Amino acid sequence: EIELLKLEKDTADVVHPFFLAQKCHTLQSMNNHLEAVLKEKRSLRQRLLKPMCQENL
């Protein structure tokens, strides 16, 4: 059991589902943010068609 617990704790960075869970939640955070960005593509290209127009601000 000393060796088995040693090899279990040495692999704590990537194997156990805890850190997998936090990296998963960061993935859904990134996906939700980028999906909120991507859903308004027509609005974004409406922003992109706005240069320095002093006549039509």
**Residue 46 structure tokens:** 């409406």
The reply to whether 4 sits near another protein by the rule CB under 8 A is: no
The reply to whether 33 sits near another protein by the rule CB under 8 A is: no
Minimum Å gap between C-beta 16 and another protein is 7
**Residue 40 structure tokens:** 């308004």
Separation between Cα atoms, residue 33 and residue 25, nearest integer Å? 12
Pick the binder of another protein from 2, 14, 48, 52 (CB under 8 A). Answer: 2
Pick the binder of another protein from 11, 16, 29, 46 (CB under 8 A). Answer: 16
Enumerate helices (H) and strands (E) in the chain, giving the number of each: 3, 0
